[PDB]
């Protein structure tokens, strides 16, 4: 399949050259897998989610996304139009309040939660969890991510947006998960992107059009928007049976576009998420 005038991150993830406008992906499109968007919520009514999203648990009073971030992320991982995987099933776990903040324990909790809860769902193709969130290094936060990840989920993790070394940021630095950096459309590391020896790969994170609350849409920029592209790239390939939750990251990394990105520091990998879709 092709999506003409696709968003550029979408066209990029499926091009071996910056510049293109179509997103080419296999049609299975993520279906079979599940993606927990552990974030602020997910306007599960967005017509763009066609009914494939649903709040599974909040850690607050509502379950609504009153922010946008998550619908945005949910969006990129698998909204019809704005998304990598147009057929994934999305579950919202709301760990971040409507300003987009969260305590490390309710996110630890959200992580132990999807580890359990996934057990009572039908996610035949793999289960991914996408954490476009983060903070200062914490070994319990890393522990949570690593538990979640060893419990069998494919944790994609934002490198962070502090254009620093992701080592002092947490999930980002749980070397066992999949820290994701951002690139812009000219193939440069996104100016805000964290980097370092712990990043495993890059995805489109600058100026990313996606779903927004109100049944709307909106571009924003972040390692927060690249994560969902690997989250969804991951999911899309799990359902493609190309890798598993336990190795989706190494595989996404080995098969990526290399040497392409400009702006990469010695120490950081020059690898850009890529689906090798051959029609």
């Amino acid at each position: 399949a092709a999506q003409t005038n696709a968003p550029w991150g979408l066209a990029r993830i499926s091009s071996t050259s910056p510049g293109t406008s179509t997103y080419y992906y296999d049609e299975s499109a993520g279906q079979g897998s599940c993606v927990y968007v552990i974030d602020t919520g997910i306007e599960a009514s967005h017509p763009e989610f066609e009914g494939r999203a649903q709040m599974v648990k909040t850690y607050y009073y509502s379950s609504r996304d009153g922010n946008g971030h998550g619908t945005h992320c949910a969006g990129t991982v698998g909204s019809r139009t704005y998304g990598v995987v147009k057929k994934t099933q999305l579950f919202g776990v709301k760990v971040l309040d409507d300003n987009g903040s969260g305590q490390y324990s309710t996110i630890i909790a959200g992580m132990d939660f999807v580890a359990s809860d996934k057990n009572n769902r039908n996610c035949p193709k793999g289960v991914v969890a996408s954490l476009s969130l983060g903070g200062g290094y914490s070994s319990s936060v890393n522990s949570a991510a690593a538990r979640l990840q060893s419990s069998g989920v494919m944790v994609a993790v934002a490198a962070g947006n502090n254009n620093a070394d992701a080592r002092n940021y947490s999930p980002a630095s749980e070397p066992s998960v999949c820290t994701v950096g951002a690139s812009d459309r000219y193939d440069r590391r996104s100016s805000f992107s964290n980097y370092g020896s712990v990043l495993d790969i890059f995805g489109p994170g600058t100026s990313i059009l996606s779903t927004w609350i109100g049944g709307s849409t909106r571009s924003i920029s972040g390692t927060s928007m690249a994560t969902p592209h690997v989250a969804g790239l991951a999911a899309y390939l799990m359902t493609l049976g190309k890798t598993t939750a336990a190795s989706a990251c190494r595989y996404i990394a080995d098969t990526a576009n290399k040497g392409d990105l400009s702006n990469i520091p010695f120490g950081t990998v020059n690898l850009l998420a890529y689906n090798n879709y051959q029609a």
Partner: peptide
């Protein structure tokens, strides 16, 4: 520390 980011 949290959004890693957007405006909302």
């Amino acid at each position: 520390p949290a959004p890693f980011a957007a405006a909302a």
